[PDB]
Structure formats: C-alpha cells, structure tokens
C-alpha cells in the first residue's frame, strides 16, 4: 500500500510540474528553431 | 487583372497575376518590396 | 501543447512561409502520423 501511494504521488507531481509552464522541452524546440532559421536565412540571402 | 500575364510597368517587367490591393500607399510611394526585394505592389501609371 | 511547430507539410493551397514557397523551398510530411505513434 505504501509503495502504491508513493508511486501515485510521484506521477501526480510529474503531471503538476509538466503542466506549470516548466519549459522543459528545450531540446525538441531547438530543432524547429534551427530549421526555421536556416530556411529564413536561405530565403533572405536572395537580396545580395 | 485576374489572368497569368506578362506585365511591363514603366520598364519594370515581370510575369504573374494582378489583383486589387488594400495597401495604403502614400502619394510619394510607387513600389512595394518583399523580404527578398521582390516587387509585390505597384501603382498604375495612368489610373493611379 | 508545450511545443509548437512551424510547418507540418500539409496542404497550403491559399508571411515567411509564403515567401519560402514562392522561391522553391518546400516541406514534406512524415510517413507515420501522430495517431500511429500514439
Ligand atoms: C491619361 O493620363 C492621366 C494622368 O492622370 C489619367 O488620369 C488618364 O486616365 C489617362 N488617360 C486618358 C485617356 O486621359
């Protein structure tokens, strides 16, 4: 019973931390940012 | 206006489709540029 | 919800994305949709 309660509490804490705008997913956002920056630079290079 | 045609505005030549625009050009403005310095808007020489 | 995309490579029949598209740069969609991964 104690182990079950501890596991449930840990899962609840994980949910609360994730939902409170923790900005934890930096690694997944970096890919999108870099790809978009590369494409925008490629397009903007046409003014030279 | 609404057909894919070649156009020549005061020696500025191009190919594309012409449509009526809502942009607010000032009296001393005649051209509109894009991120890649591509002409996007034009003032008609006669009908303004 | 936490992470937002820029272009998912879906239908773009009709900003920066239009400027990219008019200059010959396009994005292709993944084979496995999110439902299959779920
Ligand atoms: C001639 O040029 C004037 C310039 O303002 C323009 O208003 C007019 O429509 C043009 N055509 C004729 C037939 O006057």
UniProtKB/Swiss-Prot annotation, chain B:
UniProt-reported outcome of changing residue 36 to D: In strain: Alpha/B.1.1.7
Described function:
Attaches the virion to the cell membrane by interacting with host receptor, initiating the infection. The major receptor is host ACE2. When S2/S2' has been cleaved, binding to the receptor triggers direct fusion at the cell membrane. When S2/S2' has not been cleaved, binding to the receptor results in internalization of the virus by endocytosis using host TFRC and GRM2 and leading to fusion of the virion membrane with the host endosomal membrane. Alternatively, may use NRP1/NRP2 and integrin as entry receptors.
SUBUNIT field: Binds to host ACE2. RBD also interacts with the N-linked glycan on 'Asn-90' of ACE2. Cleavage of S generates a polybasic C-terminal sequence on S1 that binds to host Neuropilin-1 (NRP1) and Neuropilin-2 (NRP2) receptors. Interacts with host integrin alpha-5/beta-1 (ITGA5:ITGB1) and with ACE2 in complex with integrin alpha-5/beta-1 (ITGA5:ITGB1). May interact via cytoplasmic c-terminus with M protein. May interact (via N-terminus) with host bilirubin and biliverdin, thereby preventing antibody binding to the SARS-CoV-2 spike NTD via an allosteric mechanism.
Q: What is this protein called?
A: Spike protein S1
What gene is this protein translated from?
A: S
First and last residue shown, out of the full length, are 535 to 582 of 1273
UniProtKB/Swiss-Prot annotation, chain C:
Q: Using the UniProt annotation, give all residue ranges assigned to the region (Disordered).
A: 5-20
Effect after changing residue 23 to K: In strain: Omicron/BA.1
The UniProt annotation puts the region (Fusion peptide 1) at 1-14
Q: Name the source's superkingdom.
A: Viruses
Name the job this protein performs: Subunit of the fusion protein that is processed upon entry into the host cell. Mediates fusion of the virion and cellular membranes by functioning as a class I viral fusion protein. Contains a viral fusion peptide that is unmasked after S2 cleavage. This cleavage can occur at the cell membrane by host TMPRSS2 or during endocytosis by host CSTL. In either case, this triggers an extensive and irreversible conformational change that leads to fusion of the viral envelope with the cellular cytoplasmic membrane, releasing viral genomic RNA into the host cell cytoplasm.
| Protein known as | Spike protein S2'
Organism classification, top ranks? Viruses, Riboviria, Orthornavirae, Pisuviricota, Pisoniviricetes
Q: Which gene encodes it?
A: S
Q: Which residues of the full protein are shown?
A: 824 to 871 of 1273
């Amino acid at each position: 019973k104690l182990i079950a309660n501890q596991f449930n509490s840990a899962i609840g804490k994980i949910q609360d931390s994730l939902s409170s705008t923790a900005s934890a997913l930096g690694k997944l956002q970096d890919v999108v940012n870099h790809n978009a920056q590369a494409l925008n630079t490629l397009v903007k290079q046409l003014s030279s | 206006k609404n057909k894919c045609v070649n156009f020549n505005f005061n020696g500025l030549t191009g190919t594309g489709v012409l449509t009526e625009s809502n942009k607010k050009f000032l009296p001393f403005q005649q051209f509109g540029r894009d991120i890649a310095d591509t002409t996007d808007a034009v003032r008609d020489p006669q009908t303004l | 919800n936490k992470v937002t995309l820029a272009d998912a490579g879906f239908i773009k029949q009709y900003d920066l994305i239009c400027a990219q598209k008019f200059n010959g740069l396009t994005v292709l969609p993944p084979l496995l949709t999110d439902e299959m991964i779920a």
